[PDB]
From Swiss-Prot:
Record's function text: Catalyzes the NADPH-dependent synthesis of dihydrouridine, a modified base found in the D-loop of most tRNAs. Specifically modifies U20 in cytoplasmic tRNAs. Activity depends on the presence of guanosine at position 19 in the tRNA substrate. Negatively regulates the activation of EIF2AK2/PKR.
Disordered as annotated region, ranges: 96-122
Domain DRBM: residue ranges: 27-94
Self-association state and partner proteins as the record states: Interacts with EPRS1. Interacts (via DRBM domain) with PRKRA and EIF2AK2/PKR (via DRBM 1 domain).
UniProt modified residues of type Phosphoserine: S103
Localization annotation: Cytoplasm; Endoplasmic reticulum
Organism the protein comes from: Mus musculus (Mouse)
Parent-record interval covered: 350 to 464 of 493
Protein name: tRNA-dihydrouridine(20) synthase [NAD(P)+]-like
Free-text note on domains in this protein's UniProt record: Efficient dihydrouridine synthesis requires the presence of both the catalytic domain and the C-terminal RNA-binding DRBM domain.
Family to which this protein belongs: Belongs to the Dus family. Dus2 subfamily.
Ranges for region Interaction with tRNA: 25-29, 78-82
Length: 128
């Protein structure tokens, strides 16, 4: 059973891509896909946007109709992409994180956005 995600919709978690965590011959993004093959799951979708407050880059992966965004941006867009994967794996509970899942860090920032009502894509041609 689930542990208890904090947030209705997108599972947000504190994670920061750590190069030292993985060798130059292995990437956290490849580990995810390799996992989607066994679970007959459809390839994920990476999406990196640029904010205006900190002009920082942040990627967001989506698997099994579940989005995984990190609460920690990245200096570059390329790096942000790495985080995504990790976040996904951790959420699924794969061993593709133990490497550096935990780490001594005093970072805590919960971003909040105003919303009167939910939305999303256009599930079906008719209301749903």
């Amino acid at each position: 059973g689930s542990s208890g995600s904090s947030g209705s919709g997108i599972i947000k978690m504190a994670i920061r891509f750590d190069r030292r965590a993985y060798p130059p011959q292995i990437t956290p993004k490849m580990c995810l896909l390799e996992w989607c093959r066994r679970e007959k799951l459809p390839q994920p979708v990476y999406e990196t946007v640029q904010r205006t407050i900190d002009r920082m880059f942040c990627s967001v992966v989506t698997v099994a109709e579940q989005k995984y965004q990190s609460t920690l941006w990245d200096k570059s867009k390329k790096l942000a992409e790495q985080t995504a994967a990790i976040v996904c794996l951790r959420s699924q509970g794969l061993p593709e994180g133990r490497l550096g899942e935990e780490s001594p860090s005093l970072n805590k920032r919960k971003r909040e956005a105003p919303d009167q009502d939910p939305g999303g894509p256009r599930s079906g041609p008719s209301s749903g």
